[PDB]
Design an enzyme around this catalytic site. Structure first.
Site, PDB file in Angstrom:
ATOM      1  N   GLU A 144      16.060   3.492 -42.419  1.00 32.02           N
ATOM      2  CA  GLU A 144      17.246   3.336 -42.932  1.00 32.02           C
ATOM      3  C   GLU A 144      18.795   4.098 -41.649  1.00 32.02           C
ATOM      4  O   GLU A 144      18.549   6.042 -41.792  1.00 32.02           O
ATOM      5  CB  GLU A 144      17.603   3.384 -44.249  1.00 32.02           C
ATOM      6  CG  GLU A 144      18.934   3.022 -44.271  1.00 32.02           C
ATOM      7  CD  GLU A 144      19.613   1.587 -43.994  1.00 32.02           C
ATOM      8  OE1 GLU A 144      19.650   1.623 -43.163  1.00 32.02           O
ATOM      9  OE2 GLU A 144      19.964   0.979 -44.963  1.00 32.02           O
ATOM     10  N   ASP A 145      19.407   3.572 -41.479  1.00 36.96           N
ATOM     11  CA  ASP A 145      20.606   4.532 -40.389  1.00 36.96           C
ATOM     12  C   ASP A 145      21.418   5.429 -41.678  1.00 36.96           C
ATOM     13  O   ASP A 145      21.248   6.378 -41.006  1.00 36.96           O
ATOM     14  CB  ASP A 145      21.071   3.861 -39.892  1.00 36.96           C
ATOM     15  CG  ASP A 145      22.768   2.650 -41.001  1.00 36.96           C
ATOM     16  OD1 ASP A 145      21.902   2.640 -42.769  1.00 36.96           O
ATOM     17  OD2 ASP A 145      23.389   1.729 -40.711  1.00 36.96           O
ATOM     18  N   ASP A 148      24.434   5.903 -48.516  1.00 38.79           N
ATOM     19  CA  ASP A 148      26.171   6.198 -49.161  1.00 38.79           C
ATOM     20  C   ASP A 148      25.681   5.825 -50.415  1.00 38.79           C
ATOM     21  O   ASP A 148      26.007   6.891 -50.959  1.00 38.79           O
ATOM     22  CB  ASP A 148      26.821   5.594 -48.381  1.00 38.79           C
ATOM     23  CG  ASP A 148      28.604   6.025 -48.339  1.00 38.79           C
ATOM     24  OD1 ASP A 148      28.756   6.061 -49.011  1.00 38.79           O
ATOM     25  OD2 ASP A 148      28.721   5.474 -46.270  1.00 38.79           O
ATOM     26  N   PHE A 197      33.739   7.287 -42.666  1.00 35.91           N
ATOM     27  CA  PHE A 197      33.134   6.087 -42.280  1.00 35.91           C
ATOM     28  C   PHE A 197      32.593   6.137 -40.610  1.00 35.91           C
ATOM     29  O   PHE A 197      33.888   6.558 -40.076  1.00 35.91           O
ATOM     30  CB  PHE A 197      33.793   5.029 -42.142  1.00 35.91           C
ATOM     31  CG  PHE A 197      33.154   3.656 -42.124  1.00 35.91           C
ATOM     32  CD1 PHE A 197      32.048   3.291 -44.028  1.00 35.91           C
ATOM     33  CD2 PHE A 197      32.968   2.734 -40.845  1.00 35.91           C
ATOM     34  CE1 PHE A 197      30.964   1.991 -42.960  1.00 35.91           C
ATOM     35  CE2 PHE A 197      32.300   1.994 -40.991  1.00 35.91           C
ATOM     36  CZ  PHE A 197      31.293   1.189 -42.239  1.00 35.91           C
ATOM     37  N   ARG A 210      28.572  -1.141 -32.028  1.00 34.79           N
ATOM     38  CA  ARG A 210      27.449  -0.583 -32.189  1.00 34.79           C
ATOM     39  C   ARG A 210      26.823   0.211 -30.851  1.00 34.79           C
ATOM     40  O   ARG A 210      25.715   0.865 -31.013  1.00 34.79           O
ATOM     41  CB  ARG A 210      26.431  -1.958 -32.563  1.00 34.79           C
ATOM     42  CG  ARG A 210      26.058  -2.441 -33.666  1.00 34.79           C
ATOM     43  CD  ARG A 210      25.112  -3.314 -34.274  1.00 34.79           C
ATOM     44  NE  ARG A 210      26.381  -4.169 -35.829  1.00 34.79           N
ATOM     45  CZ  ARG A 210      25.255  -3.724 -36.203  1.00 34.79           C
ATOM     46  NH1 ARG A 210      24.722  -2.709 -37.151  1.00 34.79           N
ATOM     47  NH2 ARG A 210      25.358  -4.431 -37.523  1.00 34.79           N
TER      48      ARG A 210
HETATM   49  N1  LIG Z   1      28.840   1.601 -40.077  1.00 33.52           N
HETATM   50  C1  LIG Z   1      28.886   2.316 -40.426  1.00 33.52           C
HETATM   51  N2  LIG Z   1      29.560   3.977 -41.071  1.00 33.52           N
HETATM   52  C2  LIG Z   1      29.107   4.372 -42.811  1.00 33.52           C
HETATM   53  O1  LIG Z   1      29.483   5.829 -42.888  1.00 33.52           O
HETATM   54  C3  LIG Z   1      28.148   3.176 -43.827  1.00 33.52           C
HETATM   55  N3  LIG Z   1      27.907   3.912 -44.943  1.00 33.52           N
HETATM   56  C4  LIG Z   1      27.468   2.452 -45.146  1.00 33.52           C
HETATM   57  C5  LIG Z   1      27.171   1.413 -43.880  1.00 33.52           C
HETATM   58  C6  LIG Z   1      26.751   0.059 -44.165  1.00 33.52           C
HETATM   59  N4  LIG Z   1      24.694  -0.094 -43.749  1.00 33.52           N
HETATM   60  C7  LIG Z   1      24.122   0.980 -45.402  1.00 33.52           C
HETATM   61  C8  LIG Z   1      22.609   0.404 -44.549  1.00 33.52           C
HETATM   62  O2  LIG Z   1      23.287   0.583 -43.057  1.00 33.52           O
HETATM   63  C9  LIG Z   1      24.877   0.857 -45.814  1.00 33.52           C
HETATM   64  C10 LIG Z   1      23.877   2.238 -47.061  1.00 33.52           C
HETATM   65  P1  LIG Z   1      24.230   2.260 -49.084  1.00 33.52           P
HETATM   66  O3  LIG Z   1      25.770   2.072 -49.486  1.00 33.52           O
HETATM   67  O4  LIG Z   1      23.307   0.743 -48.826  1.00 33.52           O
HETATM   68  O5  LIG Z   1      23.251   3.537 -49.800  1.00 33.52           O
HETATM   69  C11 LIG Z   1      27.841   2.313 -43.311  1.00 33.52           C
HETATM   70  N5  LIG Z   1      27.496   1.516 -41.336  1.00 33.52           N
HETATM   71 MG   LIG Z   2      26.890  -2.254 -41.114  1.00 33.31          MG
END
Ligand SMILES: Nc1nc(O)c2[nH]cc(CN[C@H](CO)CCP(=O)(O)O)c2n1
Ligand SMILES: [Mg+2]
Length: 231
Positions: A144-145, A148, A197, A210
């Protein structure tokens, strides 16, 4: 160290690289695509530091799994860069140490999951259902990237329970120091980052940025310019 199997506990996880609230680089320090510059505040983590950290994560993963077969699960689309670099370094580390009686180390698998609009979770995770029954009784490493809110991985790990997988471990490039966090911890973590973000290294704002090689902070002008009309 044993193969992790308490998804969200990060039971034996090493501390990530800690990126301080004031850490980063001005936009003239590195190569930035000219048209993106006006929409970025700063570089938080350069491409090269990300690559160097992922090489060390691959080493940490190899140290845990040794020669035990496991199955790497890429969470598209944001994990693309991270997954690519992990495959490169895991393959090199494994194949450099291999003898003719060795075996392949890992299978590679893809799931598309989606939950964000602009810079916020909708609170619903969309999962593109490819039958994961092939992972029954397997060691799975989720790639996972970013963590959050922790909503993606809590919901995705709940979904995986139906396939009777042997173990679920999590590798995550970024974890964000946000009050929104539900406590979900990964087993292998690249960086702890401040509550901003981020875009770049496959992480998008409504499909933009991206291709940006560096992890950068998108400014309010960027958030406004590329704000979603739909969903
Ligand atoms: N570009 C970007 N930057 C951030 O700081 C971000 N924080 C959350 C995201 C969106 N994608 C994430 C998974 O790929 C969501 C993670 P979650 O909030 O569900 O733990 C995200 N995308
Ligand atoms: Mg995204």
């Amino acid at each position: 160290m044993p193969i992790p199997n308490n998804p969200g506990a990060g039971e034996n996880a090493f501390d990530p690289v800690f990126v301080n609230d004031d850490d980063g680089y001005d936009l003239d320090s590195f190569m930035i695509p000219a048209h993106y510059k006006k929409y970025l505040t700063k570089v938080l983590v350069p491409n090269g530091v990300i690559k160097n950290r992922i090489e060390k994560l691959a080493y940490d993963i190899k140290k845990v799994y040794n020669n035990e077969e496991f199955h790497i699960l890429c969470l598209l689309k944001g994990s693309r860069g991270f997954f690519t670099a992990l495959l490169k370094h895991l393959s090199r580390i494994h194949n450099y140490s291999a003898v003719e009686t060795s075996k392949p180390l890992f299978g590679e698998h893809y799931v598309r999951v989606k939950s964000y609009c602009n810079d916020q979770s909708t609170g619903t995770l969309e999962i593109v259902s490819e039958d994961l029954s092939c992972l029954k009784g397997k060691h799975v490493l989720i790639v996972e990237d970013i963590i959050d809110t922790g909503k993606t991985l809590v919901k995705f790990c709940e979904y995986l329970k139906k396939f009777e997988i042997k173990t679920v471990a999590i590798a995550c490039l970024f974890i964000k120091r946000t009050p929104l966090w539900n406590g979900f911890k990964a087993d292998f973590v690249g960086f702890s980052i401040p509550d901003h973000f981020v875009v770049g290294y496959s992480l998008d704002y409504n499909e933009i940025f991206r291709d940006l090689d560096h992890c950068c902070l998108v400014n309010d002008e960027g958030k406004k310019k590329y704000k979603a009309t739909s969903l």
